[PDB]
Amino acid sequence: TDEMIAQYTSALLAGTITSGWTFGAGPALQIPFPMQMAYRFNGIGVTQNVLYENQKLIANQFNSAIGKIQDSLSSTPSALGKLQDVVNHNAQALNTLV
Amino acid sequence: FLHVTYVPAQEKNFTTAPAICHDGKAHFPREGVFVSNGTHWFVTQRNFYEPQIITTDNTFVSGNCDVVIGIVNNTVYD
Numbered sequence: 001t002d003e004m005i006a007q008y009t010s011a012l013l014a015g016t017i018t019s020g021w022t023f024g025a026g027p028a029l030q031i032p033f034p035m036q037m038a039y040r041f042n043g044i045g046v047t048q049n050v051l052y053e054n055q056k057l058i059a060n061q062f063n064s065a066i067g068k069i070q071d072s073l074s075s076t077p078s079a080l081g082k083l084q085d086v087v088n089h090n091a092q093a094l095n096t097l098v
Numbered sequence: 099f100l101h102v103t104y105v106p107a108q109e110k111n112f113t114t115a116p117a118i119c120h121d122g123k124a125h126f127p128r129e130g131v132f133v134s135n136g137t138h139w140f141v142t143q144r145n146f147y148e149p150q151i152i153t154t155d156n157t158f159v160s161g162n163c164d165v166v167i168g169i170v171n172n173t174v175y176d
């Protein structure tokens with residue numbers, strides 16, 4: 001059901017926020033989120049001091065981008081068109097059959 | 099396909115800090131993270147627990163102490 005898929009999504013989000021990538025490769029290992037993003041900067045070749053010195057700015061940028069995502073989806077419903085396309089196609093087929 | 103993989107086990111919790119404040123300078127681990135067993139601070143690799151004394155070889159300074167959030171006071175050995 002939609003609620004069960006929502007619970008899977010919530011579990012994935014909680015694991016990513018609280019444990020980083022540890023929960024995917026084994027037991028979930030607790031870690032502060034700034035240290036997780038420090039590892040993630042270290043992966044892309046940027047030292048963790050860049051995150052720690054610019055923590056507030058990065059948090060503000062992430063919050064602004066996340067807030068803008070909802071407006072971006074709302075302004076253009078065509079972003080979901082692919083999903084809608086699927087539904088439309090199925091309906092069309094059945095209608096043709098009838 | 100027989101996939102041989104490494105799975106962590108026997109987890110233990112520790113107190114961690116982003117950086118160590120020594121003589122007016124922040125210190126970040128070159129590889130690994132800073133952990134505490136209750137009274138002493140060590141540096142360990144992320145995926146396995148082998149604590150080591152925080153020295154200048156495994157740390158780089160790169161900054162000052164006031165800007166970093168969560169910094170803690172400890173000695174960095176030379």
Ligand SMILES: *[C@@H]1O[C@H](CO)[C@@H](O)[C@H](O)[C@H]1NC(C)=O
Pocket residue numbers: 111112113
């Ligand atoms: C680790 O977990 C235990 C649970 O028994 C808790 O008492 C302790 O405060 C936690 N943190 C540390 C640093 O031991």
Ligand SMILES: *[C@@H]1O[C@H](CO)[C@@H](O)[C@H](O)[C@H]1NC(C)=O
Pocket residue numbers: 135136137138
């Ligand atoms: C932490 O480790 C040190 C070893 O450097 C030891 O002397 C100390 O007793 C340990 N503390 C605890 C609470 O286990």
Ligand SMILES: *[C@@H]1O[C@H](CO)[C@@H](O)[C@H](O)[C@H]1NC(C)=O
Pocket residue numbers: 119170171
């Ligand atoms: C310990 O850290 C605090 C940060 O709140 C700092 O004000 C203080 O100077 C540090 N200790 C020493 C001996 O410098």
